[PDB]
Design an enzyme around this catalytic site. Structure first.
Site: not given
Ligand SMILES: [Mg+2]
Ligand SMILES: [Mg+2]
Ligand SMILES: [Mg+2]
Ligand SMILES: [Mg+2]
Ligand SMILES: [Mg+2]
Lengths: 384, 384, 384, 384
Positions: D52, D55, D86, D179, D181, D215, D218, D243, D253, D255, D285
């Site tokens: 990100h 990030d 990505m 993406e 969700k 995802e 997701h 993902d 979530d 993950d 992810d």
């Molecule tokens: Mg997630």
């Protein structure tokens, strides 16, 4: 519909002041002074508030520092007349409880979880509490071999007995109540529902000192009927405290205000709660959405109380309606309440009304008249 | 991986003889003579069979017809050498049970629910059944006021109490198992999970007669961890029976063959059953999909026993691997079985090692090592 | 709250004629002749009815009695004034569609699936139908390898492409609508939600003739907000038809009365349909529970139109309330309807009011006023 | 089973540097250095990383500390060979987006989220990214009247149109990937599934530059079949990215690392990804739990690539078995690839093999042999 102190409307210190620290976001709201929480809730017609240790006193603060917060909190309750019907212990926020408190794999933290929750039991009783709540959110696992569930329940039973032995020793006027939850934060939480919690109590050494603390969203996080779960908790007679909020579907623990989410379930809950005679607190373990400022804080607080009374009035006239009373007799709720075979086992076997001469087709051809009954329950909720 | 009678594999008559009739479809395969099915599982390697009363004798059959079906069924088991470990009664098929059996709103239909149960309990003891399963699929409601939940439990306890008085008055070497289910065919079935059933048992007049009969798909229909449910059932010593099949999420009860769906939950289930010394029947309450033929109803049935036995091998070699053992010790699985405070409550309070002298930062900094452990369990499952 | 033929309420033939057959029980009610269903639905205030390919005429009937069933129905539509807005095909029920209709593995069933469907759209045109609905209740699989879902969608595209070719050839004023459903009776159904259906529409040869027919219960079986999916369908301009019933929770398709279950979702739905001016049919695809007699199926059928009209009155007075429009000002519903970058991209790059000189905290400290707005909607829903 | 950069395994900067801060707990792990993560990942066998905007470069840092954060990281990628396939924009953590980013109810914050995304787009293209992900996790609301979804979809349709115009203006070779969700952090998210996103793309002005980034968790957070959802994206040809993680049941979530959760769905995914020839980055992810220290987050990421190599190895051996090839023909998967009616609509009408002379009984009596096929897939995966 404005509430009165006799409504036993209690909140917590974590309900407001949540700051909105979402898994995917930072804080948005102000750190609420534990004193200034009990102001507005007294100014909004509520009676009582609850708290964790770390909610009232900062973690790590020593005695005379902890004593400075207790006195500041005591003068606030005595000036506003608010009470504290319940206290809790924080065993999830600090990183020391990664694998749980009472059911941690490490033995060091397991004994530290007891000492932390025992010093708080003294504070709970010295404030006029009527129930102590234990939420085992960290008691769980994500992978299989990471926790023997039989061994973890051996420690959870051992921990609750140690607590019950302590309250009997000091003679505190208190009883415990386990708050269940199916998941979050762990992949699967131990004692995930009211049934799993009620069964666990019946093995504890002193079962009469333990009850359940169900919350609307937690049981609705498993797709279960909350008015049915409260009825089983009431049928067993082990309902000591209740958390109320709203929740839609099977998702993350969304603590919406009471009334939101499942509105019909909120109607039948207040109906069963008042019809059964529950005289404990109406605690709201909700969080105002981080979408709000310091003005929507109390709108959500006053909203769940303003709601509760609305469905209370409509569920009362629903049972007081004579036309509905006849529809319930049509649904044959006059039966179902009287015993099935109170004449004994031998009398049932000799009775041919129950077998040989039981016209199965005539009884099967009678409609239960549930739709006309449920529509009357509808129109009473909307107003017609 | 060929099943043997030593493995105690039973199936049931309605399982592999299912109509193929879903709510939106007619029947795919023809009905099966109960003897045809018995010869069938015996050749594959099954140990027993289970049955509803209406699965062996058709509904509305006279004495001569109900006593001619048992003789053809008795000769089948005398030949194949298979036993009948479990038996249940059908109180959901006939349109006289739309409102329920033991908790029906009509007083007279409740008695016939017990008269039909007693007649089948009496015959289960003839075949040497040792556990009688009760599945209340119609005990529930779809709307609020349609059913008093506290009154319904008052009739289910009374129901269950008078057949416990019957089996004791007859001297039958038989106990009861409750099969829980959250929903379907009713909107909300009472006692939805195994915990609600376990909490219901310890309010019965003689709790030693009644246990829980969990099924994989049912507890996964509530979003719960099934291997966690059996661990608590084994913890109370009330796992009188079990039903093995698959489920892929919170959906309708599909009852596909065991091993399908949540594959990892079946690995942890077969690991917990063997490591706990469970000796009851490993019985499959599965329904082959309607898209299969008569050669596919037993390709799927054989897949049930094999999916179990190869999971039994991967789970045994997992916990028998020496490399996983100190990997288990690295996760402090040994410290979990150690009693938290066997030194006493008075010794725990006088031990400041568990409070003031406790270093929470050092205890929080340890690594648990669950993911390295879980990958070893993934390796033994896949064969790597 | 008496419905009128201008409210345009529609009821399927299978809707109130469901004999009550679930996977666990036999039928409860009698078989409703198609003629008597129309006269009763019109006495309650409905506008039209809906039929399947096999609900109007039995399966395997000769074409002599085929016209008899049509003419005998053609007695009751003109003599009553009801209409037929929607017609559909029965590509389930029969065992030929074990694996599906348009996406079966055998071409034997795929070609018969189309010949059967075109045979009914000829009848739908004669009855003045405007939307022909297709529901892939059997298109999918319970295992992974049983269906290459890429080749399956190639066959749904193949089947749907020539259906719009036969309609465009016969000059019919008829359009198509997809009914999404995530699961049941199949393990996983192709095009599970409205979005997957809309995406599948934009890949066919003639996307102008295909829309969606969403049901409030089918989308809630996946936890999705149904008022959200209808809003996306209306934003794409593809809401040709809609199914109205009831469902509470992720479980089997209950098909409850409209308003039952998630009443909040039912409130925001009628608020959405009446806001956008949706002038299609208000078709109720529900099934009265097996507990009802014949009197119960019509009080439930009347209850569908009853609570749509009561929700219409509350939602209208909600947005027409003066103090609600001012709360929408505080909630800033003005700006979301305003264009974001109406001044172009190069002006967006040269505008520092949107980056450098943009106050981050003064814009994050504002309150969305969502909760005081939502309680204003709750007070209107409950008539407070 | 050790991976190589030829396997295109990428990990997120937020994946292994997650710190553990969750809804119910403080931080557990130390914050990792972006230069360190790439070293550690390359020595484990990874090919690239994500980031990100907040990030890689902290929020609110200067323009001098900016490229200081960019250069040393760039020097790390070329010194070890890692790339950045990505990149995405953080539009959720800061309290500025508490209502959303692209479709926020205030216009001044909508333009701000765009001017932040285009900057990271300039960097994403300079570093060599091929896709850019726009997941609007804060797009939605919790009450009904808080978000007009039609006007909200216009602001998102307007948002992507601007950023797509900027991409074609700067001459970049960059495509977007939405993406989806369903829920969390907001109550309901806009475009909750793959289909809702795909249908939203076709309405966009230049749909060629937009795709999906589904995802694994997701989609099954709504009970959906993820192998079913990927091949519909592969069908439309819009799978620009994917993902990889794990999830068990409809809930928050989790993950988990890939392989954990739905082990069978993970098997069928890499089977379809290899058969369809997916050449995009196998991005992860996932988030290792709080329980692990620093040695566990690398073992968790190591098992991430390990489980992909095991499943791909057993998916290739499955579809290459001569016995499975004949079982797939007995299931008649080959006829699923043949066109339904390539002879024309007229020939479909004139052929009564598909209707009048069709043997409906003999076609339904044919078994699909799905169970034997699914067992072979089980035995191949379970090393038998
Ligand atoms: Mg997630
Ligand atoms: Mg909660
Ligand atoms: Mg079942
Ligand atoms: Mg339906
Ligand atoms: Mg329909």
């Amino acid at each position: 519909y404005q509430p009165t102190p006799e409504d036993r409307f209690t909140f917590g210190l974590w309900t407001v002041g949540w700051q909105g620290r979402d898994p995917f976001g930072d804080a948005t709201r102000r750190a609420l002074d534990p004193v200034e929480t009990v102001q507005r809730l007294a100014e909004l017609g509520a009676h009582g508030v609850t708290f964790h240790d770390d909610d009232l006193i900062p973690f790590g603060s020593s005695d005379a520092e902890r004593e400075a917060h207790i006195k500041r909190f005591r003068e606030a309750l005595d000036a506003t007349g608010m009470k504290v019907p319940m206290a809790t212990t924080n065993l999830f926020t600090h990183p020391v409880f990664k694998d749980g408190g009472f059911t941690a794999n490490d033995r060091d933290v397991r004994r530290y979880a007891l000492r932390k929750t025992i010093r708080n039991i003294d504070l709970a009783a010295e404030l006029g509490a009527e129930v102590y709540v234990a939420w085992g959110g960290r008691e769980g696992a994500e992978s299989g071999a990471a926790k023997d569930v039989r061994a973890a329940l051996d420690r959870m039973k051992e921990a609750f007995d140690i607590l019950g032995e302590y309250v009997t020793a000091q003679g505190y006027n208190l009883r415990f109540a386990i708050e269940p939850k199916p998941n979050e934060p762990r992949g699967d939480i131990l004692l995930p529902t009211v049934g799993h919690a009620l069964a666990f109590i019946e093995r504890l050494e002193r079962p009469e000192l333990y009850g359940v603390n169900p919350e609307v969203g937690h049981e609705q996080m498993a797709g279960l009927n909350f008015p049915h779960g409260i009825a089983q908790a009431l049928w067993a007679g082990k309902l000591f405290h209740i958390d109320l909020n709203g929740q839609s579907g099977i998702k993350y623990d969304q603590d919406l205000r009471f009334g939101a989410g499942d509105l019909r379930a909120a109607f039948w809950l207040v109906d069963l709660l008042e019809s059964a005679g529950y005289e404990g607190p109406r605690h709201f373990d909700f969080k105002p959405p981080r979408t709000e400022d310091l003005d929507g804080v109390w709108a959500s607080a006053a909203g769940c109380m303003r709601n509760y009374l609305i469905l209370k009035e409509r569920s009362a006239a629903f049972r007081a309606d004579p036309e509905v009373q006849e529809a319930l007799r049509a649904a044959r709720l006059d039966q179902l309440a009287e015993p099935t075979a109170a004449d004994g086992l031998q009398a049932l076997l000799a009775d041919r009304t129950a077998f040989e001469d039981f016209d199965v087709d005539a009884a099967a051809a009678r409609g239960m008249a549930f739709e006309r009954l449920d529509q009357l329950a509808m129109d009473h909720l909307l107003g017609a």
